[PDB]
Amino acid sequence: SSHTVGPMLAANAFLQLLEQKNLFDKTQRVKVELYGSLALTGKGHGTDKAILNGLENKAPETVDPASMIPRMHEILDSNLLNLAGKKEIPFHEATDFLFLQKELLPKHSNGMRFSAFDGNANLLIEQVYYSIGGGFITTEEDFDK
Amino acid sequence: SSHTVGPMLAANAFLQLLEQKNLFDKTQRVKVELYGSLALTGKGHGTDKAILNGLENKAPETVDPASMIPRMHEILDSNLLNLAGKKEIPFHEATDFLFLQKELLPKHSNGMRFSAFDGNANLLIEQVYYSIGGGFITTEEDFDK
Numbered sequence A, B: 001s002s003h004t005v006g007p008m009l010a011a012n013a014f015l016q017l018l019e020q021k022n023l024f025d026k027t028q029r030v031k032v033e034l035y036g037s038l039a040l041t042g043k044g045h046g047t048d049k050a051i052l053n054g055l056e057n058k059a060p061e062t063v064d065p066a067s068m069i070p071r072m073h074e075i076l077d078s079n080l081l082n083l084a085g086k087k088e089i090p091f092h093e094a095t096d097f098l099f100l101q102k103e104l105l106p107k108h109s110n111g112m113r114f115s116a117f118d119g120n121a122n123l124l125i126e127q128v129y130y131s132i133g134g135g136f137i138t139t140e141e142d143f144d145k
């Protein structure tokens, strides 16, 4: 149930990373990859809804929950994601939201990787997050500190 | 050209790597990801043929070319890959052979990533290769030497 809250925050964090690193403007495609139990608790079971809305800068106290499923549907239907609420970018689930049930990130089971790409298909940045406890968030590299 | 020969060799190099690093015995699943130009000549257009048989240690100046398509088919049909021809392991295309047409590895367009995992879904090793020229091969980290 920190399969909803945590992933929403992770997305949110990734959005700020894009600003912090001045790669938001250059970003034309985004990819999300879920692992271990996050991946296992599948398509339609909260986490995708949570992540997409969060990538749109909805955030989990701020946001309205009745709106989350409709909004996911619009995103898939239109193939447009409103990154951080500022920019509409192409989105294709087959390609941009993966459930890797057979795979495990090494720190913990509830793992995620966020990736941004520019319009010439170059990777701009990659960031791994984990959600643990009630649904607090941590980066790969802060996990152990 | 270097859409068949090169990738076959790359799969070969990976097999040697597995042996060279003493991870062949721990390996219980394998994954291949194609990028740029390699991913773009799709399912059934050479490169999957070539890689699978190469992962079976068929090797390209020495394999029977009449045998490659039938064999790829059995691998898919049976869902078993006979790694380095020493060991049958579970294989699922949906999961283990990916054509990432919307992505580029950074050095060159003909990129490949080989991954091996143990039976606990732990990743044992990644290796990126590229095929260049006639179909000579190189690793990521040797590309610039």
Ligand SMILES: [Mg+2]
Pocket: A076, A077, A078, A079
């Ligand atoms: Mg659509």
Ligand SMILES: [Mg+2]
Pocket: B076, B077, B078, B079
């Ligand atoms: Mg089958």
